[PDB]
């Protein structure tokens, strides 16, 4: 998931932003 | 805002500021 | 270990230390 | 919450395993 | 998004954040 | 500036965006 | 407590963490 | 003083303490 | 030592609080 | 250069960043 | 020591470095 | 630049020094 795709691709704030809660 | 090359406590931190108040969960795979 | 006070991204960098590959949740409104 | 259990007061990274998944 | 208390190193890493790529300025003084 | 509208009182990072090149 | 993969600053922070007020040395290699 | 191996914010967070009051300006390549 | 293992391979906390004073 | 309040972790990165490849001692309690 | 010549009152990256090995 | 040069070999503290205000 996100975690991967931030640290192997790259990831915009606006994929973070659905984990919040 | 750009996209983010975003490993460990950085993406930890991150999510802390885009989420805020709000919260978030920290779900990595296995 | 010790005793801290952790606040804002401080306390979501030590959840991420102490947690890892189990991942964690930040709900500061509860 | 957590906030107040580490922010305000103090907290051990023991309690701070109580929010791991 | 949200808002929170950013001080100094924090104000930093949140402009890194934000900007990235394009770059920034810090100027305190200002 | 920053600071002031930062640290002191709150910004969100849309206000930060005006600080990027 | 996880296993943590850790390097540079990030080591002297999990340093700061686990030690405390007992404080600590960091020696590294060379 | 050393030399140091500086990516991402941590770059960012070095010029914060190198240059502190002063501020200063971060420009990436492309 | 501990930096390198802590680096190149990895380390746990508990291996860490050896360098405790 | 200049100079700044360090406090926590902030310090300890603060050392690393000085100090680097030489190590560093840090010890609140003194 | 340290945490008082820095956290408390203020130090500069010299005194710092009397902290280095 | 500095950003690529600190990252990619390395650099010192006096070389950052140029880019302050
Ligand atoms: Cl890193
Ligand atoms: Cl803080
Ligand atoms: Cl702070
Ligand atoms: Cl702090
Ligand atoms: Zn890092
Ligand atoms: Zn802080």
Known sequence: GIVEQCCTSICSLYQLENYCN | ?30
């Open chain 2, 1 to 30: 805002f750009v996209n983010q090359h975003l490993c460990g406590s950085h993406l930890v931190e991150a999510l802390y500021l885009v989420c805020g108040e709000r919260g978030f969960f920290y779900t990595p795979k296995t």
